[PDB]
Tab-separated table of C-alpha atoms and ligand atoms in Angstrom:
chain	number	residue	atom	x	y	z
A	9	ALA	CA	24.975	133.591	54.134
A	10	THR	CA	28.014	134.061	56.362
A	11	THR	CA	31.501	132.819	55.597
A	12	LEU	CA	32.789	129.428	56.734
A	13	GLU	CA	35.175	130.525	59.484
A	14	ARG	CA	32.282	132.264	61.237
A	15	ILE	CA	30.485	128.948	61.778
A	16	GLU	CA	31.592	127.821	65.235
A	17	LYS	CA	30.543	124.173	64.960
A	18	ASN	CA	32.359	120.896	64.205
A	19	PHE	CA	32.246	120.170	60.502
A	20	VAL	CA	34.188	119.247	57.402
A	21	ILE	CA	33.624	119.488	53.675
A	22	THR	CA	34.892	116.778	51.300
A	23	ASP	CA	35.307	116.604	47.530
A	24	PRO	CA	33.880	113.292	46.245
A	25	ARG	CA	35.242	113.980	42.746
A	26	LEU	CA	38.800	113.298	43.988
A	27	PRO	CA	40.140	109.814	44.804
A	28	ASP	CA	38.796	108.652	48.164
A	29	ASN	CA	36.672	111.740	48.882
A	30	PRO	CA	39.292	113.934	50.687
A	31	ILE	CA	38.562	116.702	53.191
A	32	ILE	CA	38.863	120.132	51.546
A	33	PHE	CA	37.758	122.138	54.583
A	34	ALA	CA	37.719	121.559	58.324
A	35	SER	CA	36.464	123.952	60.988
A	36	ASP	CA	38.613	125.000	63.946
A	37	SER	CA	36.163	123.311	66.323
A	38	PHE	CA	36.581	120.013	64.461
A	39	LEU	CA	40.365	120.311	64.720
A	40	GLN	CA	40.033	121.107	68.426
A	41	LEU	CA	37.628	118.223	69.028
A	42	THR	CA	39.830	115.718	67.190
A	43	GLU	CA	43.247	117.139	68.193
A	44	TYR	CA	44.520	117.067	64.609
A	45	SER	CA	46.082	119.961	62.732
A	46	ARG	CA	44.526	121.308	59.547
A	47	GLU	CA	47.689	120.062	57.838
A	48	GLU	CA	46.994	116.510	59.069
A	49	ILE	CA	43.358	116.465	57.936
A	50	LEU	CA	42.974	118.230	54.589
A	51	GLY	CA	43.598	116.003	51.577
A	52	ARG	CA	42.728	112.880	53.562
A	53	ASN	CA	39.742	110.623	54.181
A	54	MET	CA	38.119	111.014	57.589
A	55	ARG	CA	38.035	107.272	58.368
A	56	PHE	CA	40.962	107.758	60.796
A	57	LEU	CA	38.435	108.859	63.431
A	58	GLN	CA	37.275	105.233	63.657
A	59	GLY	CA	38.807	102.716	66.046
A	60	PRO	CA	38.483	99.447	68.007
A	61	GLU	CA	35.050	100.065	69.539
A	62	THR	CA	33.536	101.723	66.476
A	63	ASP	CA	30.489	99.856	65.218
A	64	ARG	CA	31.440	98.864	61.670
A	65	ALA	CA	27.800	98.308	60.793
A	66	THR	CA	27.236	102.016	61.499
A	67	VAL	CA	30.259	102.881	59.336
A	68	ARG	CA	28.675	100.922	56.460
A	69	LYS	CA	25.530	103.099	56.717
A	70	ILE	CA	27.798	106.103	56.189
A	71	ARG	CA	29.539	104.485	53.216
A	72	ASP	CA	26.178	103.502	51.718
A	73	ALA	CA	24.755	107.042	52.031
A	74	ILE	CA	27.883	108.482	50.383
A	75	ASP	CA	27.692	105.947	47.515
A	76	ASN	CA	24.015	106.716	46.952
A	77	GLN	CA	24.646	110.461	47.216
A	78	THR	CA	22.076	110.910	49.982
A	79	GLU	CA	21.984	112.305	53.515
A	80	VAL	CA	22.302	110.220	56.666
A	81	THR	CA	22.496	110.658	60.444
A	82	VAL	CA	24.062	108.152	62.829
A	83	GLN	CA	25.842	107.884	66.174
A	84	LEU	CA	29.143	106.085	66.529
A	85	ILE	CA	32.285	105.943	68.605
A	86	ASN	CA	35.209	107.976	67.235
A	87	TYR	CA	38.724	108.687	68.538
A	88	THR	CA	40.918	111.756	68.866
A	89	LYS	CA	44.547	111.838	67.764
A	90	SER	CA	45.566	110.802	71.288
A	91	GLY	CA	43.161	107.840	71.346
A	92	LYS	CA	40.551	109.516	73.530
A	93	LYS	CA	37.095	108.001	72.915
A	94	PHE	CA	34.016	110.071	72.176
A	95	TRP	CA	30.470	109.551	70.952
A	96	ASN	CA	29.758	111.251	67.637
A	97	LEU	CA	26.246	112.194	66.551
A	98	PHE	CA	27.095	112.584	62.891
A	99	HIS	CA	25.127	114.083	60.007
A	100	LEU	CA	26.179	113.878	56.386
A	101	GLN	CA	24.587	115.481	53.329
A	102	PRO	CA	25.413	116.264	49.687
A	103	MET	CA	25.782	119.812	48.435
A	104	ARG	CA	24.661	120.021	44.822
A	105	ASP	CA	25.583	122.442	42.047
A	106	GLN	CA	23.089	124.122	39.710
A	107	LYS	CA	22.827	121.095	37.422
A	108	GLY	CA	21.844	119.135	40.534
A	109	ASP	CA	25.137	117.229	40.517
A	110	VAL	CA	26.828	116.550	43.844
A	111	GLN	CA	29.794	118.871	44.358
A	112	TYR	CA	30.659	118.269	48.021
A	113	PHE	CA	29.663	116.349	51.109
A	114	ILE	CA	29.059	118.290	54.299
A	115	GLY	CA	29.625	116.471	57.572
A	116	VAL	CA	28.646	117.746	61.019
A	117	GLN	CA	29.786	116.261	64.338
A	118	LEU	CA	28.020	116.722	67.663
A	119	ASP	CA	30.254	115.085	70.265
A	120	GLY	CA	29.347	113.657	73.667
A	121	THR	CA	30.289	110.980	76.169
A	122	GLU	CA	27.209	108.854	75.568
A	123	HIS	CA	24.971	107.290	72.926
A	124	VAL	CA	21.881	109.534	73.190
A	125	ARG	CA	18.334	108.213	72.693
A	126	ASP	CA	14.698	109.278	72.457
A	127	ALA	CA	14.170	113.014	73.171
A	128	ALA	CA	17.883	113.856	73.500
A	129	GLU	CA	18.566	112.081	70.204
A	130	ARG	CA	15.751	113.898	68.431
A	131	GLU	CA	16.990	117.289	69.668
A	132	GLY	CA	20.540	116.445	68.596
A	133	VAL	CA	19.418	115.585	65.060
A	134	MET	CA	17.484	118.823	64.552
A	135	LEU	CA	20.487	120.798	65.747
A	136	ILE	CA	23.122	119.321	63.391
A	137	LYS	CA	20.701	119.427	60.466
A	138	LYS	CA	20.271	123.170	60.974
A	139	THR	CA	24.061	123.573	61.151
A	140	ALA	CA	24.411	121.581	57.931
A	141	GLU	CA	22.035	123.941	56.156
A	142	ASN	CA	24.053	126.958	57.347
A	143	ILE	CA	27.247	125.369	56.031
A	144	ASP	CA	25.643	124.606	52.674
A	145	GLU	CA	24.690	128.279	52.283
A	146	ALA	CA	28.149	129.491	53.389
A	147	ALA	CA	29.919	126.895	51.201
A	148	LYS	CA	28.240	128.188	48.052
A	149	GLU	CA	30.691	131.101	48.407
A	150	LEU	CA	33.840	128.975	48.753
A	151	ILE	CA	36.239	129.999	45.983
A	152	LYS	CA	37.775	127.087	44.087
A	153	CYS	CA	41.361	127.637	42.922
A	154	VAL	CA	43.186	124.848	41.073
A	155	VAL	CA	47.007	124.882	40.862
A	156	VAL	CA	48.681	123.131	37.886
A	157	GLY	CA	52.135	123.003	36.236
A	158	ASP	CA	55.233	120.807	35.746
A	159	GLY	CA	56.588	118.632	38.541
A	160	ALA	CA	58.997	120.436	40.889
A	161	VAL	CA	58.080	123.967	39.749
A	162	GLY	CA	57.040	124.693	43.342
A	163	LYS	CA	53.236	124.372	43.388
A	164	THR	CA	53.155	122.706	46.822
A	165	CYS	CA	55.830	124.891	48.473
A	166	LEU	CA	53.903	127.893	47.287
A	167	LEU	CA	50.782	126.546	49.073
A	168	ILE	CA	52.596	125.545	52.257
A	169	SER	CA	54.495	128.837	52.466
A	170	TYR	CA	51.291	130.844	52.065
A	171	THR	CA	49.173	128.884	54.532
A	172	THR	CA	51.836	128.211	57.192
A	173	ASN	CA	54.578	130.799	56.615
A	174	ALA	CA	57.080	127.945	56.698
A	175	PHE	CA	59.128	126.347	53.918
A	176	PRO	CA	59.220	122.564	53.429
A	177	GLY	CA	62.447	120.578	53.325
A	178	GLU	CA	62.288	117.406	51.266
A	179	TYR	CA	60.650	117.426	47.853
A	180	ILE	CA	57.671	115.049	47.817
A	181	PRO	CA	55.747	114.825	44.519
A	182	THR	CA	52.007	115.451	44.853
A	183	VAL	CA	49.105	113.277	43.817
A	184	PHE	CA	46.273	115.479	45.094
A	185	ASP	CA	46.187	117.702	48.159
A	186	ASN	CA	44.124	120.584	49.501
A	187	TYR	CA	44.673	123.809	51.375
A	188	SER	CA	42.405	126.544	52.659
A	189	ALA	CA	42.822	130.226	53.483
A	190	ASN	CA	40.596	132.994	54.788
A	191	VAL	CA	41.651	136.174	52.990
A	192	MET	CA	40.666	139.807	53.565
A	193	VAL	CA	39.696	141.392	50.271
A	194	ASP	CA	38.397	144.979	50.380
A	195	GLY	CA	37.661	144.604	54.101
A	196	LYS	CA	35.632	141.383	53.741
A	197	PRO	CA	36.543	137.755	54.578
A	198	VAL	CA	36.783	135.331	51.658
A	199	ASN	CA	37.064	131.539	51.859
A	200	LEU	CA	39.655	130.208	49.434
A	201	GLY	CA	40.039	126.512	48.690
A	202	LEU	CA	43.256	125.496	46.950
A	203	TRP	CA	43.469	122.275	44.946
A	204	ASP	CA	47.090	121.079	44.655
A	205	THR	CA	47.746	118.708	41.734
A	206	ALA	CA	50.408	116.443	40.213
A	207	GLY	CA	52.910	117.815	37.694
A	208	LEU	CA	53.917	114.434	36.286
A	209	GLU	CA	52.498	113.333	32.924
A	210	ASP	CA	51.552	109.861	34.220
A	211	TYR	CA	48.814	111.651	36.205
A	212	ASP	CA	47.231	113.163	33.092
A	213	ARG	CA	44.203	110.885	33.465
A	214	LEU	CA	43.621	111.690	37.148
A	215	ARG	CA	44.357	115.434	37.235
A	216	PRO	CA	41.142	116.658	35.522
A	217	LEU	CA	39.063	115.199	38.399
A	218	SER	CA	39.939	118.484	40.099
A	219	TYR	CA	38.657	120.695	37.262
A	220	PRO	CA	34.837	120.851	37.309
A	221	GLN	CA	33.391	124.039	38.849
A	222	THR	CA	36.822	125.649	39.166
A	223	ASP	CA	36.677	129.440	39.671
A	224	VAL	CA	40.282	130.321	38.805
A	225	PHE	CA	43.367	128.399	37.691
A	226	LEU	CA	46.949	129.049	38.660
A	227	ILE	CA	49.210	127.857	35.850
A	228	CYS	CA	52.728	127.723	37.300
A	229	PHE	CA	56.215	127.501	35.822
A	230	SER	CA	59.675	127.964	37.327
A	231	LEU	CA	61.492	131.183	36.388
A	232	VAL	CA	64.691	129.110	36.244
A	233	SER	CA	63.379	126.216	34.151
A	234	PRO	CA	62.713	127.165	30.523
A	235	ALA	CA	61.220	123.693	29.871
A	236	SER	CA	58.529	124.276	32.487
A	237	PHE	CA	57.940	127.613	30.766
A	238	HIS	CA	57.388	126.222	27.270
A	239	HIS	CA	55.101	123.539	28.735
A	240	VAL	CA	52.779	126.383	29.753
A	241	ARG	CA	51.997	126.906	26.080
A	242	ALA	CA	52.312	123.316	24.917
A	243	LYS	CA	50.621	121.403	27.744
A	244	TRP	CA	48.976	123.226	30.678
A	245	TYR	CA	47.123	125.979	28.820
A	246	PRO	CA	45.546	123.554	26.325
A	247	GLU	CA	44.683	121.005	29.039
A	248	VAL	CA	42.989	123.623	31.199
A	249	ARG	CA	41.060	125.205	28.315
A	250	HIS	CA	39.997	121.771	27.061
A	251	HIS	CA	38.054	121.169	30.292
A	252	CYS	CA	37.316	124.758	31.395
A	253	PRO	CA	36.956	126.956	28.277
A	254	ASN	CA	35.799	130.014	30.227
A	255	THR	CA	37.665	129.802	33.550
A	256	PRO	CA	40.150	132.651	34.207
A	257	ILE	CA	43.844	131.744	34.247
A	258	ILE	CA	46.568	133.433	36.251
A	259	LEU	CA	50.099	132.726	35.010
A	260	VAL	CA	52.540	132.361	37.902
A	261	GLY	CA	56.342	132.455	37.685
A	262	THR	CA	57.825	130.623	40.665
A	263	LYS	CA	61.172	130.580	42.463
A	264	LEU	CA	61.661	134.304	41.855
A	265	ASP	CA	64.511	134.191	44.390
A	266	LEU	CA	66.602	131.963	42.131
A	267	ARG	CA	66.455	134.213	39.065
A	268	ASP	CA	69.248	136.394	40.496
A	269	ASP	CA	70.910	133.540	42.392
A	270	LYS	CA	74.596	133.242	41.427
A	271	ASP	CA	74.803	129.426	41.467
A	272	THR	CA	71.522	129.036	39.592
A	273	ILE	CA	72.542	131.430	36.829
A	274	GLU	CA	75.806	129.498	36.505
A	275	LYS	CA	74.034	126.131	36.308
A	276	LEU	CA	71.673	127.458	33.636
A	277	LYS	CA	74.683	128.926	31.839
A	278	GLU	CA	76.259	125.469	31.773
A	279	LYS	CA	73.045	124.241	30.092
A	280	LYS	CA	73.263	127.068	27.560
A	281	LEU	CA	70.126	128.597	29.070
A	282	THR	CA	69.097	131.721	30.926
A	283	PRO	CA	66.282	132.445	33.422
A	284	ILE	CA	62.828	133.524	32.264
A	285	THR	CA	62.524	137.332	32.314
A	286	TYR	CA	59.471	139.293	33.443
A	287	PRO	CA	58.776	140.520	29.867
A	288	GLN	CA	59.013	136.901	28.714
A	289	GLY	CA	56.537	135.734	31.362
A	290	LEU	CA	54.244	138.648	30.583
A	291	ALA	CA	54.342	137.758	26.889
A	292	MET	CA	53.449	134.132	27.607
A	293	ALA	CA	50.607	135.372	29.818
A	294	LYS	CA	49.287	137.544	26.977
A	295	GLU	CA	49.641	134.689	24.499
A	296	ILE	CA	47.461	132.305	26.530
A	297	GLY	CA	44.967	135.005	27.482
A	298	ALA	CA	45.818	134.909	31.197
A	299	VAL	CA	44.151	137.682	33.232
A	300	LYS	CA	47.350	138.277	35.226
A	301	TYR	CA	51.062	137.556	35.118
A	302	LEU	CA	52.550	137.287	38.602
A	303	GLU	CA	55.981	136.328	39.930
A	304	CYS	CA	56.725	135.111	43.415
A	305	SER	CA	59.011	133.112	45.672
A	306	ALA	CA	57.643	130.574	48.116
A	307	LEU	CA	60.959	130.790	49.982
A	308	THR	CA	61.149	134.539	50.633
A	309	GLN	CA	57.373	135.024	50.181
A	310	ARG	CA	58.020	137.897	47.782
A	311	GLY	CA	54.874	138.402	45.710
A	312	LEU	CA	53.248	135.463	47.513
A	313	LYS	CA	50.182	137.131	49.089
A	314	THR	CA	49.503	138.960	45.820
A	315	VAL	CA	49.106	135.668	43.965
A	316	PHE	CA	46.139	134.568	46.085
A	317	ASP	CA	44.674	138.053	46.438
A	318	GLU	CA	44.638	138.336	42.630
A	319	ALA	CA	43.259	134.805	42.297
A	320	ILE	CA	40.249	135.882	44.360
A	321	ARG	CA	39.881	139.202	42.544
A	322	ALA	CA	39.858	137.423	39.178
A	323	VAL	CA	36.722	135.683	40.433
A	324	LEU	CA	34.968	138.350	42.527
A	325	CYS	CA	35.842	141.675	40.853
B	1352	GTP	N1	64.781	128.514	45.914
B	1352	GTP	C1	63.511	128.128	45.853
B	1352	GTP	N2	63.216	126.786	45.701
B	1352	GTP	C2	61.922	126.373	45.640
B	1352	GTP	C3	60.875	127.284	45.721
B	1352	GTP	N3	59.715	126.578	45.628
B	1352	GTP	C4	60.006	125.261	45.488
B	1352	GTP	N4	61.373	125.124	45.514
B	1352	GTP	C5	62.155	123.884	45.364
B	1352	GTP	O1	61.614	123.091	44.324
B	1352	GTP	C6	61.269	121.795	44.788
B	1352	GTP	C7	59.927	121.403	44.175
B	1352	GTP	O2	58.941	121.996	44.999
B	1352	GTP	P1	57.404	121.525	45.008
B	1352	GTP	O3	56.552	122.637	45.565
B	1352	GTP	O4	57.280	120.240	45.788
B	1352	GTP	O5	57.104	121.211	43.459
B	1352	GTP	P2	55.666	120.822	42.844
B	1352	GTP	O6	55.276	121.738	41.713
B	1352	GTP	O7	54.649	120.882	43.944
B	1352	GTP	O8	55.965	119.374	42.186
B	1352	GTP	P3	54.919	118.161	41.959
B	1352	GTP	O9	54.123	117.892	43.190
B	1352	GTP	O10	55.685	116.893	41.639
B	1352	GTP	O11	54.005	118.462	40.789
B	1352	GTP	C8	61.162	121.923	46.299
B	1352	GTP	O12	61.625	120.768	46.950
B	1352	GTP	C9	62.069	123.073	46.643
B	1352	GTP	O13	63.334	122.524	46.907
B	1352	GTP	C10	61.166	128.646	45.870
B	1352	GTP	O14	60.260	129.482	45.938
B	1352	GTP	N5	62.487	129.062	45.936
B	1353	FMN	C1	31.628	114.843	55.023
B	1353	FMN	C2	32.357	113.686	55.649
B	1353	FMN	C3	32.485	113.669	57.029
B	1353	FMN	C4	32.780	112.486	57.689
B	1353	FMN	N1	32.887	112.520	59.057
B	1353	FMN	C5	33.159	111.367	59.754
B	1353	FMN	C6	33.255	111.393	61.150
B	1353	FMN	O1	32.894	112.383	61.791
B	1353	FMN	N2	33.534	110.225	61.830
B	1353	FMN	C7	33.698	109.040	61.138
B	1353	FMN	O2	33.943	107.998	61.746
B	1353	FMN	N3	33.600	109.020	59.763
B	1353	FMN	C8	33.326	110.174	59.062
B	1353	FMN	N4	33.248	110.113	57.686
B	1353	FMN	C9	33.029	108.740	57.077
B	1353	FMN	C10	34.313	108.175	56.461
B	1353	FMN	O3	34.994	109.149	55.707
B	1353	FMN	C11	34.078	106.989	55.525
B	1353	FMN	O4	33.263	107.339	54.426
B	1353	FMN	C12	33.477	105.781	56.229
B	1353	FMN	O5	34.510	105.184	56.981
B	1353	FMN	C13	33.045	104.781	55.174
B	1353	FMN	O6	34.165	104.719	54.321
B	1353	FMN	P1	35.112	103.422	54.297
B	1353	FMN	O7	34.265	102.201	54.580
B	1353	FMN	O8	35.701	103.340	52.905
B	1353	FMN	O9	36.183	103.535	55.357
B	1353	FMN	C14	32.950	111.288	56.995
B	1353	FMN	C15	32.828	111.312	55.607
B	1353	FMN	C16	32.525	112.499	54.930
B	1353	FMN	C17	31.894	112.404	53.563
B	1354	CL	CL1	63.222	124.730	38.611
B	1355	CL	CL1	62.686	136.977	46.235
B	1356	MG	MG1	53.492	119.225	44.660
């Protein structure tokens, strides 16, 4: 099996365990075909491709196949971001884990300007079905990394900084969201899927939908919020272990850039607090049996690449 980025076809992978079956991977060709950015697609349901002339009866066949966890192939009109119409010969199929449970849906698009029939149709179907099988094999190697921790500790910024090299402005709390990265490890490409989650306690009942089949967890806390730090021990570590007793945990200290920041130190001082020190983070890591303690700053990117490199290594090496 190859890796996912080496499959030059239109396709996406969704996670049906999460609310509304969001896209967790999209190929470059798909993004090109549809004119969306990866940022606009991941974390969302693909229904946005549908439009005025889309046959809603055909859409129901898709919904029905998904609900029954079976494969289906149909042709329907879809639309690009700019409203450009195209015909979509679409194949969907479940990817199952060892215990035969559905883990993902794979979806393959073969685009054209017409509704193909007879021989052309038959050829089209055999083609996308073969592609689907290739994806299934490649997807078995997708590494699942789940990112948890208090609200506002910087889980999302960390993911955006790493995958886009930009830093976000406004703080927007997360429900669920997904990111992907292709990372060189020891000279070989690795596909890394990142599951962003909600820090707020009112999401305690939803959050664990992300947990099954997780390869490595990032438990995050802010180096300049001691409360987020103690919650590592009191909340996140127990929650993670409760669902995933054997999954490796990497402890991540965030906002490294603020630990030596004048104004931040002063504000903490006014609260009768001080920043979390490396030895303190290390000690927490040891206490919860984390395989690595790592500090980083989404803003400056210091220690950022190392976080995801080590995430992968905790799984593969
Ligand atoms: N100085 C500095 N500020 C950061 C850094 N990372 C995040 N922040 C700030 O902290 C705020 C919270 O960032 P988020 O990444 O959205 O926090 P989160 O953990 O994803 O929060 P929830 O989605 O609610 O669980 C951001 O708006 C930034 O202003 C960092 O590396 N350095
Ligand atoms: C793997 C995956 C790929 C999908 N690809 C498409 C697509 O190419 N075009 C499209 O119109 N819908 C696609 N969908 C179908 C929609 O996401 C959605 O399930 C369909 O609209 C029925 O859902 P709804 O009735 O709740 O909107 C895809 C779904 C999944 C599971
Ligand atoms: Cl903070
Ligand atoms: Cl820094
Ligand atoms: Mg967030």
